[PDB]
Each structure stands twice: as structure tokens, then as C-alpha cells.
Amino acid sequence: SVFSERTEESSAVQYFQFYGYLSQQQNMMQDYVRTGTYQRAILQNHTDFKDKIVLDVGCGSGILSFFAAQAGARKIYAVEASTMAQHAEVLVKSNNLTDRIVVIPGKVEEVSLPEQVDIIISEPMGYMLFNERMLESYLHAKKYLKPSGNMFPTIGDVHLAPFTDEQLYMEQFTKANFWYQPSFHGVDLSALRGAAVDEYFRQPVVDTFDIRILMAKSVKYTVNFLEAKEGDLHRIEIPFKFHMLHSGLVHGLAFWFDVAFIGSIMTVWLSTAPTEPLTHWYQVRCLFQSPLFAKAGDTLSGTCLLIANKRQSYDISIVAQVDQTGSKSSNLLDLKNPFFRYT
Amino acid sequence: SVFSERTEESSAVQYFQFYGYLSQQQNMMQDYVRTGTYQRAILQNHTDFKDKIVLDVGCGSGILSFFAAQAGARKIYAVEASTMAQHAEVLVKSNNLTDRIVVIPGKVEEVSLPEQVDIIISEPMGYMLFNERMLESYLHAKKYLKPSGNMFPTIGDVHLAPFTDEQLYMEQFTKANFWYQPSFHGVDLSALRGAAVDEYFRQPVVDTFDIRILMAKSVKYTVNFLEAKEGDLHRIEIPFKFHMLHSGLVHGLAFWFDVAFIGSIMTVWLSTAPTEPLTHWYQVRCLFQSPLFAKAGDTLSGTCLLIANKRQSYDISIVAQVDQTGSKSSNLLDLKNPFFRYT
Amino acid sequence: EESSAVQYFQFYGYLSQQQNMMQDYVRTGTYQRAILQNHTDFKDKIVLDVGCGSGILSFFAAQAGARKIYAVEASTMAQHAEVLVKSNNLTDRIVVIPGKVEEVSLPEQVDIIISEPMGYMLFNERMLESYLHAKKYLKPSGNMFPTIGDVHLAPFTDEQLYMEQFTKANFWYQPSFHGVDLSALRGAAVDEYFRQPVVDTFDIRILMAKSVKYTVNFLEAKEGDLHRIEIPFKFHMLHSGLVHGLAFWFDVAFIGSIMTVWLSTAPTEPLTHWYQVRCLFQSPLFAKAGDTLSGTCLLIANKRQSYDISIVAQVDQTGSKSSNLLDLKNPFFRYT
Amino acid sequence: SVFSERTEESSAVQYFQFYGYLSQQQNMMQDYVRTGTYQRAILQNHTDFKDKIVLDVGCGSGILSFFAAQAGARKIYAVEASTMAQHAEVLVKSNNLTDRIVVIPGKVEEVSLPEQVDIIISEPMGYMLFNERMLESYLHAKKYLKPSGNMFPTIGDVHLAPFTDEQLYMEQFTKANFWYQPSFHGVDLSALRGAAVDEYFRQPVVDTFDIRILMAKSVKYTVNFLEAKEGDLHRIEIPFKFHMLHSGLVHGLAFWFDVAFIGSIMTVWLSTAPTEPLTHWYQVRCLFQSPLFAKAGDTLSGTCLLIANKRQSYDISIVAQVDQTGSKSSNLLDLKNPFFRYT
Ligand SMILES: CCOC(=O)C(=O)CN(CC[C@H](N)C(=O)O)C[C@H]1O[C@@H](n2cnc3c(N)ncnc32)[C@H](O)[C@@H]1O
Ligand SMILES: Nc1ncnc2c1ncn2[C@@H]1O[C@H](CSCC[C@H]([NH3+])C(=O)O)[C@@H](O)[C@H]1O
Ligand SMILES: Nc1ncnc2c1ncn2[C@@H]1O[C@H](CSCC[C@H]([NH3+])C(=O)O)[C@@H](O)[C@H]1O
Ligand SMILES: Nc1ncnc2c1ncn2[C@@H]1O[C@H](CSCC[C@H]([NH3+])C(=O)O)[C@@H](O)[C@H]1O
């Protein structure tokens, strides 16, 4: 199948084991911004759902299908690959919606749906939008989408901005310098210090931060889910040119994302920006191996290349240069294993 | 091999991947009670190592092998299945111990050793002692042990005691009651309440606690590593009969463990008891879904049954009754998915 | 029901209960203040005291110069009031008439009716109906003391109380209480506990929105108006969080010719023997600051001299709704 | 029925409304002394129950019937007049005991049983044993008892003893003197002081106390439920002669009670004495209007007469005199309206 060909089994097992927990669905559901914004988007665009056929990709508990039901959908196919699928069936039955919602256990790449749909709904966004690579299943599901059908969310924006955080940068060495001692219980650990430094810097940092550490307005990379194909997400090249608003040391790049629901009545935005209330996605920061000095007015240019890997995640490659000085720094990060710093 | 027939590919991959990180090694090493107590056990029993052949099962960073070298071992075979093996060899070289520590990459069930050993060392203890199932590899390694050789640790004591903690119980009940809502954003979730409670209470609670919450003297279950066979750890049946010292609600059972290093010069104990300084193992508590009332003088009897599973952990069944009244509780826990409650 | 009335009037026949009421200085002092400072509404007037008890209000009316006070009391306290009238040398002015105001015959119409008919949440005990019934003896230009009553409602957050009640219900969750499985009743137990209005006081900071007010004008209203009392509400949430229920209190106003005097049982005011009342939701509602919480509190009069209370509340922005039933006759007195 | 004939409608309605609440059943159930002693009494006398026909008078939640089922009864008729009867039916089914326990809604005086029973069980004890007059229903149920049938409880002991408690006594005047003031908001209340004193002294005081307030060994009055007839409980005359152990002022009589379960295997006692752990019955004290001075060695003689009233309670008449001095005191108390003093 399409899913299995792009994912090591070991990862998929863990992934769907993870989403089989009611506690995780609860964790997502209790994020008021998320759930409220999806509900707001679906109900305020009721003309996009009333008497329509809907597909819920990865329905989990089923919450979005029930929202689609509130909006008047004629028939909702709710596909779910984890065991959560049975619980969804339970909720469908207990909410007297069996005539309207059909739970389909399995992967959307592998199940067969009987008819074309007017609209697809889903919540496939991970850290940095793309983590978990579920966006590809979302795009894959358009094989069941009627031409001129719609996608909720309709588009996704990834934002990048350079940041300064001396303490975060210093933290890595403070942790790694554990190994820089000649007699830990009589053992010289120092030979592993460089390896420890490298290991820490390959971890993207998941947490939030004060927006005051940001040194330039973000660069935006847009995925239009109506236009994009699954293959578009295998290699994501995000060039950037930052016009520095502040003078100082740039320690790395900060990441967050927005998604938009573009309905017939209105467009509704779900934002994970550090200027907005915190969500369960937080934000993500990728350090440069070496800080770059920049003056306000200078340009910081380079590339963030996201390469999809077989663990349902991405290898992140960042190259940055201060154009005015030629000072250069890069980093390569493994997004499947982020460091959760939030407290 | 013995390891692969009894272990899922997915679980083993994540396990040995997990232990491939220097940061996790740093976390274990920075547990001073653990590391210091091991070093104390090995050095104070230097005669059990002097000019001896040693096997270190799962050497990780190699720290125990270095202790064995400090104590005068002539040759140490250090077996390690994760990529950490590469790092351990780096340390063996930078510490000029190549003539004495031989790193052998691979699983102890699969590698070939050149000779039998006089003593086996390892740190195979997990949560509730048994989690991760490394004790089976530790016991499996005895095929390389000479007829009158020794094991460090030599024995392991599991301790059980009932506790009262209304707040923890109500905490979990508070979490589970989310699924009690009849109108979460208009959706009746209640049909799943029972499912939510089951899932939450199946999580052993990992943390520490004040000893005064204990309602009776602990019961001890001893595993003798010198005599026990690997197969013995597939199904562990722990009967218990507590003589209640205090009247009140028993909300569940608390678990911790001791291990002993029985050397020629001394017996050295490593304890994770709540009366002792905290370790990275903390303590473990298994909640009853419903508490049992008992009076001082009553006896609380039952069985704790541990079933080894394919995810390198245990299915826990706890059945307990207040003998005088017939008040009974039965519970099942999934040790692989614990609740980390500390700070 | 005869059964309810017997207990009611036996309860009010005890001197200790009168003492308990009298020793509420806010109540007694505020009543006295309302009557004396509007003394011209009583001076040389005819008064009816509905449910006079010990007679204290009739005595206030006498102090204000009333020419004649008919003090109606159905409990045996009526006999104690007459003792006080004699020992206070007011036989020429206070006439105790034992019996129910619905059943006695009065010699003349009155200029003003006084009474203390307020129960928990104002309406408990359904004595307001007797008060309004008594208006048959009221002159066209007559007055009522109190004249109006305001019921105040506000959403509140109080996790401690909610878990307190759930902890109690959790008893019925046991699969083996002395070997007996009680759990099949847990749903019934929760329902019962959560049907208890909680009588006590609280810190005003638990309130999550400015209160909503429902006013009953005793001068205008009919007895019949009180069998079904429908109180709609729309709260504009000031704080984000879990709404665990609705808090209730009441004010009454004595609108006299000289001044208006207010008696308040609000949590911002000194405590009275009425405290305040809270109705818990079985499931709390999450609301954000700025959201709207709308719904209805419906009071249906029953034959046990009280009301069946249905509270339905909804967060308008999410559709999260909670429904609840309270038996006002059996409250939980939490105050200590 | 005999029940409707001895109780005003108003009282019975309130009584059975009161007992229709689960919280009330719960409070009785959570009295461990009570519930546990009944369970012990029934299980330890299993030969009095195994394959027998049982009558449970006023089963409430049904708990005693379930104890009888545990002891092996072939059949239990569980009679209950409040709406609790319904909830009892639910528990019998959910506990898979419909073939052995038959819930019979109604008053034991009014329902019909299909057959005679071997043993009657009940918990009919009120304050000072006799309050609520349920013992008459219990004795009435003997119309269904086989000759040589048994009753659990089998006997009831009411204990009386003189006590000294100056503070309790003074409390009464402190409370009544509220009315002894010439200008309560301008009103002279004093004419009612005597009535207030009266009202307070007519209330039996419910609470517990230090046994050291007792001034003589108690006198015991026994009801043998096997022999007694309903009518025996309408008028209960308890003569007493106390031999004073301590010198001082006697302020009244303290009351408590025991019941005994006289089975074929053993006798089990349920005691509410102030020397025993507290129960929901506490103890009861009836004050004398005027205290009596007694010397150690003096005799305090008199009568406690309990007269049943239609409010399902008793009018208590107590007359006592110190024989050596002739000083005399009386009190008339209404057990229906006690003062709950316990704090
Ligand atoms: C929570 C406290 O509740 C209260 O405020 C009251 O009910 C006030 N209480 C006490 C107030 C008292 N007057 C005082 O201020 O001293 C009501 C009194 O009115 C009597 N009564 C109730 N119905 C009655 C009826 N149809 N006909 C005649 N009498 C009635 C009652 O027997 C009682 O004596
Ligand atoms: N290819 C796939 N096919 C089906 N379900 C999937 C797939 N990939 C991920 N999922 C599920 O999609 C869900 C993403 S989480 C969103 C769940 C739910 N719609 C909610 O908003 O609460 C998880 O339950 C995953 O198990
Ligand atoms: N069957 C096995 N064979 C070899 N190594 C193993 C096996 N099971 C676990 N391990 C490794 O053993 C280690 C357990 S942690 C103990 C490491 C070291 N003794 C120290 O105290 O620092 C990890 O590095 C695991 O990867
Ligand atoms: N005459 C009567 N007939 C039937 N039930 C009665 C009668 N009098 C009292 N009861 C009930 O008897 C119970 C008294 S206490 C509850 C006793 C129960 N067996 C237990 O141990 O928990 C109440 O449920 C009353 O409603």
C-alpha cells in the first residue's frame, strides 16, 4: 500500500499505538483553540456541509465528524487506522448518528470508500506542521474528492524566523560538558564530549518562548492542500531572506504554523504563533552550530530543506549566511526525536 | 535467538535506539546512588574481581567494566547491543584499558564469548524491578558463568505495601471524568467513560511519596539470580497477606525493590525504598479503581501476578481482599505505559 | 400535602427556631430599620403581619405607631406571641389571629401587609404564595413590606465542592462493599447527590460573570404566578475556566413613603441565616472569557411546599450544555 | 394495618421519604461497627442460615439480605416500604441473586409472604434502642416465623446510668436566657423565658461523652425479641436503683444499648456503649429539671417510663430521688425532637 511503502513498520506501529489512547485524544480535544477553531470553522461554514458527503481523515474520537454532523452533512465517512476506531463507533451509536456517520477502520491509503465526497476534513498537522507526515495521507485522500471539492483545512502556512537565546545555546554545552571530566568515578569521559554536543544540537527544541527573542519578521511557506500533491511533501525546500529588525547574535531558527479553512462563507484561521495563545503544538526551535552576528538592516539568507524519512518524520537541513559579512552557519536536525524543554 | 522469539521487532528497535543516546547514559550515570553504590559494591569486593574474568551484560557507556577494571579484573567482556557500544570502545581506548576491557557489540543471547567467566555484572533493573525484561538476559548470560561463579547483583527483593492517597486517586478520577461529559462541544462522550477509567487506572504511577501513607509492613518477594532461570520471569506470582497497621482506605499497592551484591568481603545493598534516598527508579504505585476500607488488625490478602509481554514489559494483575469483610478489588495494569507524576 | 404542612408548622412552633431567626441581626435590624424609618406608612394605620411567629414584626409595627395589627400565625407559636403582646401591654393594638392567612377571616381591610416569607433561594417553603394570597385584605392604595424581591444568579467555579460531592457518590461505585456489588446504583447516587442545592457562603472571587437578576414585584404579582417561575439567563463570562454551577442569592426591598430599605443576602454582604445557595452541574462547562453562557432556571411548584428546579445551561460558542435537577426541599448544609 | 393504626400519616411519610435516600443508606452502611458486626454475626453463624428461609425486615439497600446470601440461605424475603425497595431490586439482579433474594415492596405489616421463614433479620434500633418504633414491625413480622425460628438480633439491652455534667446542664439556661431581656429591639421577651427553658429540657441530648461522667454502674432493661409481643413496646417501665460510686450532683440519666445475636455457633454483640467505639447512635442523655446531690454510697432510686406516641417515638418520663435525703426530681422528654449536640 501507499502508506507502508513510505514508512518503516516499527514507526507506524508506535504511531497508531500512540493514537489508540483515549488520553491522547483527550489531550488534543482539551486544547480549546484547536477544537474550538475546527468547530467554529465547520459550523460558520455550514453551507459547505449541509446535505454534503464528507470524509474525515483520521477521525480519532470522531469529534470533527460530529462537528460535520452538526453542520448538516448528509453522510460522513470517518476513517481511522488506530484502535480508536472502535470507540468512534461507540460514540456514533450513542449519539444516534449511525444513519449519518460511518466509521471505517483502516488506513485511508488502504480502505476503499464507496463514493466521491464533497469535502475532506482532517487534523493532520504535527510539530512544524509536517511532523508525522500525516499531511500526505490528507493529500492522498483527494482520490476520493470530487473535482472542485473542498479541503478543511484548505491551506497551511509554515513560518520561520531567526532568534536569539544565549541561555538556550549555552545550555547544550552545559549538558554536554558532563562528559568533559577526567575522573567520573575514576573514568575519563572527555573523549565523548564532542559526540554529546552533536547529539544535543541535532534535537529540535519543542517549547514556547517570548516573542521578544525574534529578530526578523517570519518567512512563510504555503502549502495549498487543494492544489498540492502527496509527492510535494517528500522534499520541502524553504528558501529564506530575513531582513534583520534587531542587532545581535542569531542562535537559530524558530518555527510555527497556521492553517486556514477557506469556506464559502468565511475563512477561519488556526494559528500556533508565539503571539497567539499556546497550543499542544507549542513552537519549535532549531539551533545553528555557531551563532551568527547580524546588524539590524542586514540580511540573513539561506535554506531550510525538509527531507522526509522512513520514520514518519523529517531530516531538517538549515543553511544560513549573513549576506553583508559572509559569516556562515548550518545545522542538520532529526525532527522525530525533539527535545521537550517546556516547563 | 532467545531474545528475538520473545521480543517484538518494534519494541526492541525503540529500546536499543533509546539506549543509543548519550543523554540517557548521562541520566543513568548522574544517578549518584546507583553509580556510587555499584562502584562501592565492586571495589569493596575487589577480591571477587582481582585477576578474574568478568562479563558485563549491557555495558552501556562501559562504566561497570571500568569499575571491574579498577577492582583488578584481568579481562572483562563487555557486551552491548545498542550503538552505544561504539562509544564505549572510544572510552576504553582513551582510558588505555584495551588489554582488559573487550567490547562485544550485540545481544548477549547472540554473541560468542571466547571463554567462561568468573563473575557477571549488570544493571538490568527497571521500574518495579522487572520492567524492560533485561533480567532475563542477565539470567540468560549464566551460560557463560563457571559453576561456582558469582553475580553482581546477586539477589533482588521486590517490596509491596498498601497505601492511602485520596488525592492521587481523585486526580486520576478527575482526568477520567472528562469522558463523563454529556455535551463536550455538543457531543455525548459518556458512553466511553468506563473505557477512560480503565485506561487511566491501568497506568502505574511512577513517583515518590511519604512513607506515612503506607498502611502495613511491606511484603517481600525475592529473586535469587544465582539459581533462577530465565523462564522463571515469564510469569511471576506474588502472594501477599498484609496485617493492617492503620484503619482507612486502601487506594492501592506501592512497589519498590532492593538488590544485593553479595561479595566475599561484603554484602552491599542498592535500595529504591521510599525510606531511602531517591533514585531514577522512584517508586511505583498501582491504584485500585475503587478503594477498599480496612480496620487496623484486619488482613489484606491477595495476589500480584506479572505476565511478561512482547513489548518487554509486564501485564500486571492485582487481586486483593479484606479478609474480614470480603471487600475485594481486582485490577490490571500496563507497566509499559506508566504515568510519570514527579515534579 | 398535609404531611408537609404538619412538619412545617411543627418546625416553626419551636421557640429555639424563633430565637435562631431573631438572632440574625442583619434580618431583624434591617426589618426594624425598614419599618421605623418609614414610620409614616404605619402611623395610625391598619397592618397585617403574615406569619408573625413570635410577633417581632408586629411589635415593630406597633413601635411605628400602627393603630391595629392583625398578626396571623398557624403554628402554636401563635400562643407565645399572645403572651408577649400581654406582657408588653399592647393588647389594644396587636391582635393575634391563630390560623392560616388563607383560612382566617379578618375584621377589616388593611393599609399595609408585612411579612418575612423568604426562604432559601427566596422561594423555598412557598410562603410567598400566602403573602400574595393575603393581598385580598389589602386596600387599593395599600403597601407590602417587603415590596419586591430580586433573585440573583451567577456562574461559579469551585472544583473542591464538586469533588466533595463526587467523592460521596463514589461510594456507590464499589464492586465489593463487604462482598456486595453496589456499582449498578452509582448513576442513581450521583444524580441524588447532585440534586442537593448547597447552602453556604463563599468568596466572591469564585464568580465568573456579573450576576443576572429576576425581580418579583409582590404588589403586582398573583399567587398563581409562582407555581411556574421561568428565569432565563445570558452571562458574559469575565474569566476563563470551568463552570461548576450557578450561585443564587436574593435581595428584598421595602419601598416606603420616606425611603427604600434593602435587605440583601448577597455574598458581598454580611452573612444572614439564608447564606447563599449553589446548584452544581453534574458535568462542569468549560468557558472562555468573552463567551456567552445562556439558559434557563425553571422552578415548578410541588405539593411538598417547595420547587422542582431544572437548570439548563449552555456555552453558546461551543454548544456544551449541562442540565440539572435540584430538589430544593432537601439541601446540603455545608456551612460550619 | 397495625402500622397505619399506630402512626399519623404525616410522620410515616417523612420517615419513609427520609429512608428513600441513598445517602441515608450509605451513612448507615458506612458505620463499620454496625455493618461489620451484622456481617460477622451472620457469617459466623452460617448454620443458622445455610439453606434456610430468611425474612429481612426493612432491607433498605438490601445489605443484610446479601450477608444472608453469603451465609448460604436458600431463600431471602427482603421487605422494604420506602422507594429504596426499587434500588434494592437493582442490586439483587446485578449481583445475580434473583433466584434467592426476593424484594417485596411495602410495609411488613401489610405485605404477604408466600411461606413461613426460619429466621428474621433486621436493623430496627433507634436512639436509646426504641426510637422510631421499628422494633414493633420487627416483632410484628413474627407472624411469619416458624416455631423455634430465630431472630437476629435476638435480644436488646437498654442501659441507664446517672451522670454529672455541669456544663451541659448550664448550656440550657445559657440558651433560654436569650429570652430574658427587657428590650430586644425594644421588645420585652422575658415572659417566654420559662417556656424556652422548658422546651430545651424536653429534648434528649444526642452525643457521646467521657465515661468518667458516670456516677454509678448502669441498670439494664432487656427485651427478648423471641418472646416479646408488639404491645409490650407501647409502654416500657424501667425501674432503677443506682448505688452511687461517686459523690456529686446528678444532672440526669445517660442511655445506651446493646443487641445480641444468639446463634447456634456463637453469640455476637453489637454495643453502642460509651466504652465502645462510636456508632451513628452515639449515646443519649436526659437531664433532670433540677440536679440531685448524692453521696458515694447513697442510693438513687426511681423510674424511667417510655410511652409510645403517634409520631413514631416516645414520651419519656423520668422520676428519681436520693433515698437517703428524699430530694426528688422529674423530667418529661419528647424523644421525637432530640438535640444533636455532637461536634
Ligand atoms: C429560612 C427562614 O425562612 C423564613 O424566612 C420564614 O419562613 C419566616 N417564618 C418566620 C417569620 C416570623 N414571623 C418572624 O419574623 O419572627 C414564617 C412564619 O410564618 C408562619 N407561616 C407560614 N405559612 C403560613 C400561613 N399560610 N399562614 C399563617 N402563618 C404562616 C410560619 O409558621 C412561621 O411562623
Ligand atoms: N493514514 C491514516 N489513515 C487513517 N487514520 C490515520 C492515518 N494517519 C493517521 N491517522 C489517525 O489520524 C488521527 C490524527 S489526530 C486527529 C484525530 C481527530 N480527528 C481529532 O481531531 O480529535 C489519529 O487518530 C491517527 O491514528
Ligand atoms: N539483551 C541485551 N544484550 C545486550 N545489551 C543489552 C541487552 N538488554 C539491554 N542492553 C543494554 O544494557 C544497558 C542497560 S543500562 C546499564 C548500562 C550500564 N551498565 C550503566 O550502568 O551505565 C543499555 O545500554 C541497553 O541497551
Ligand atoms: N414497617 C416497615 N416495613 C418495611 N420497611 C420498614 C418498616 N419500617 C422501617 N422500614 C425500613 O427499614 C429500614 C431501616 S434502616 C435500614 C436497614 C438495612 N437493613 C441496613 O442495615 O442498612 C429503612 O429502609 C426503612 O424504610
Decide which of B125, B153, B181 is a domain's last residue. B153
Resolution of this model in Å is: 2.6
CB pairs under 8 A between B and C: 53
Same domain, B159 and B120: no
Q: For residue A189, list chain B residues with Cβ-Cβ distance below 8 A.
A: 61, 91
* Amino acid at the residue D317: S
Q: Are C113 and C142 in contact (CB under 8 A)?
A: yes
Same domain, C211 and C259: yes
State the Cα–Cα distance between residues A231 and A236, nearest whole angstrom. Answer: 10
Quick check: C286 and A32 CB within 8 A?
A: yes
Q: Which ligand is nearest to the CA of C331?
A: 1
Helix (H, G, I), strand (E, B) or coil at D41: helix
Do C201 and C287 have their domain in common? yes
Owner of C-alpha cell 456508632: D279
Cβ pair C178:B328 closer than 8 A: no
Annotated binding site of C for S-adenosyl-L-methionine: 18, 27, 51, 73, 102, 130
* Cβ B270 vs Cβ B153: under 8 Å: yes
Strands D155-163, D117-122: pairing is unpaired
Provide DSSP, B90-145: HHHHHTT-TTTEEEEES-TTT---SS-EEEEEE---BTTBTTTSHHHHHHHGGGGE
CA of C77 to the centre of ligand 1 (A): 10
Peptide bond before C146: cis, by omega within 30 degrees of 0? yes
Alpha helices (runs of H) in D95-165, residue ranges in sequence order: 135-140
C24 is annotated as an active-site residue = yes
DSSP code string of A275-288:
TS---TT-EEEEEE
- Beta-sheet pairing, B205-207 with B339-340: parallel
CB D158 within 8 A of CB D128: yes
As beta bridge partners, residue B235 has B307
Long-range contacts of range C22-27, CB-CB < 8 Å, 24 or more positions apart?
A: C22/C54, C22/C56, C22/D184, C23/D178, C24/C272, C24/C273, C26/C263, C26/C269, C26/C270, C26/C271, C26/C272, C27/C116, C27/C263, C27/C272, C27/C273
Lookup: cell for A58: 483520521
Choose among C217, C210, C87, C79: nearest CA to C155.
Answer: C210
Specify the CATH number for the domain of residue C235: 2.70.160.11
CB atoms inside a 10 Å sphere around CB A319:
17
Domain total of chain D: 2
Residues B131 and B167 reside in one and the same domain = no
Is A159 found in the same domain as A81?
no
Which residue type, as a one-letter code, is found at position A341? R
Nearest to D191 among C23, C83, C189 (CB): C83
Q: A256 with A297, same domain?
A: yes
Q: A183 in helix, strand or coil?
A: coil
Residue D329 C-alpha cell reads as: 426530681
D263 neighbors D189 (Cβ within 8 angstroms): no
Q: Does residue A268 line the site of ligand 2, with CB under 6 A? A: no
Using CB atoms, which chains have 3+ pairs under 8 A with C?
Answer: A, B, D
Q: In what order do the strands lie in the sheet with B235-243?
A: B235-243, B299-308, B314-322, B327-334
Of A133, A153, A173, the position where a domain reaches its end is A153
Q: Which of A101, A134, A153 is a domain's end point?
A: A153
What grid cell was written down for C12?
416553626
Q: Taking Cα atoms as reference points, which of D34, D49, D55, D165 lies closest to residue D101?
A: D55
Say which amino acid occupies D221. Y
∠ CA D100-D105-D109, nearest 5°, is 105
B132 and B256 part of one domain: no
Instruction: Return the C-alpha cell found at D264.
Output: 447456634
In sequence order, the 6+-apart residues with CB closer than 8 A to the CB of B220 are B157, B158, B159
| List of chains touching D (3+ CB pairs within 8 A) | B, C
- Among candidate residues D48, D56, D89, D132, the one labeled active-site is D132
- The range of the structural domain enclosing residue C327 comes to 148-336
Query: What is the grid cell recorded at D315?
Result: 414520651
Could you say which of A14, A23, A187 has the minimum Cβ distance to residue B200?
A23
Helix H, strand E, coil C: the string for chain C is: CHHHHHHHHHHCCCHHHHHHHHCCHHHHHHHHHHHHHCHHHCCCCEEEEECCCCCHHHHHHHHCCCCEEEEEECCCHHHHHHHHHHHCCCCCCEEEEECCCCCCCCCCCEEEEEECCCECCECHHHCHHHHHHHHHHEEEEEEEECCEEEEEEEEECCHHHHHHHHHHHHHHHCCCECCECCHHHHHHHHHHHHCCCEEECCCHHHECCCCEEEEEECCCCCHHHHCEEEEEEEEECCCCEEEEEEEEEEEEEEECCCCEEEEECCCCCCCCCCCEEEEEEEEEEEECCCCEEEEEEEEEEECCCEEEEEEEEEECCCCCEEEEEEECCCCEECCC
**Bind-site residues of D for S-adenosyl-L-methionine:** 25, 34, 58, 80, 109, 137
Phi, psi of A70 (to 5 degrees): -60, -35
Residues of A catalogued as catalytic: 31, 123, 132, 280
Do D247 and D110 belong together in one domain? no
The answer to whether D180 touches D237, Cβ cutoff 8 Å, is no
- What is the number of alpha carbons within 13 Å of residue D285 lying toward its C-beta? 26
Distance CA C44, CA C65 (A): 6
* D241 DSSP β-pair partners: D301
D64 three-state secondary structure = helix
Note whether A16 and A81 are within 8 A (CB): yes
Q: Length of chain C in residues, anyone?
A: 336
| C25-37 vs C56-63: helix crossing angle, rounded to 10 | 30
Answer whether C9 contacts ligand 1 (Cβ < 6 A).
yes
A211 and A266 belong to one structural domain: yes
Q: What is the CATH number of the domain that holds B89?
A: 3.40.50.150
Contacts of B167 (CB under 8 A, 6+ apart): none
D188/D81 same-domain check: no
CA distances to A37, A224, A272, A282, D115 from A260, in Å: 10, 10, 12, 18, 76
Do C92 and C184 belong to one domain? no
Q: What is the DSSP letter of D175?
A: H
* Domain co-membership, B129 together with B172: no
Q: Note the ligand closest to the C-alpha atom of C73.
A: 1
Q: Amino acid identity, residue D198? A: D
Pairing state between β D283-294 and D248-262: antiparallel
Q: Are D281 and D272 in contact (CB under 8 A)?
A: yes
Residue A111 is which amino acid? V
d(CA C68, CA C56): 15
At which residue does the C-alpha cell 437578576 appear?
Answer: C213
Query: Sign of the C-alpha dihedral, residues A38, A43, A49, A54?
Result: positive
* Distance of alpha carbon A328 from the chain centroid: 28
CA-based nearest residue to A189, from B122, B106, B60: B60
Integer distance in angstroms from the first to the last C-alpha of chain B? 41
Q: Which helix (H) or strand (E) holds A166?
A: helix A166-176
Ligand closest to CA B84: 3
Separation of alpha carbons A5 and A137, rounded Å: 13
Nearest to C184 among D90, D191, D192 (CB): D90
CA of D234 to the centre of ligand 4 (A): 20
Q: Do C179 and B328 touch (CB under 8 A)?
A: yes
Which amino acid, B252? G
- In chain C, residues with a C-beta closer than 8 Å to the C-beta of D185 are 28-29, 32, 56, 59-60
- Measured CA to CA, the distance from residue D131 to residue B230 in angstroms comes to 67
Three cell numbers at D217?
454502674
Most distant CA pair in chain D: distance in Å?
Answer: 74
- B63 C-beta closer than 6 A to ligand 3: yes
Residue owning the nearest CA to atom 1 of ligand 4: D107
- Cβ(B20)–Cβ(B124) under 8 Å? no
Phi, psi of A81 (to 5 degrees): -90, -25
**Nearest to residue C119, comparing CAs of C254, C247, C277, C271?**
C277
DSSP assignments along D258-307, one per residue:
EEEEE-SS-EEEEE--TTS---TT-EEEEEEEEEEEE-TT-EEEEEEEEE
* In the block, residue with C-alpha cell 470522531: A62
CB contact under 8 A, B295 and D70: no
Sign of dihedral through CA atoms D120, D126, D130, D136?
negative
> Is there a contact between D36 and B326 if contact means CB atoms under 8 Å apart?
no
Measured in Å, residue B28 CA sits from the centre of ligand 3 at 11
Element of type H or E holding B66? helix B63-70
Query: Does ligand 2 come within 6 angstroms of the Cβ of A108?
Result: yes
The verdict on whether D280 is a catalytic residue reads yes
Question: Solved by what technique?
Answer: X-ray
E runs forming strands in A87-204: 101-105, 117-122, 145-152, 155-163
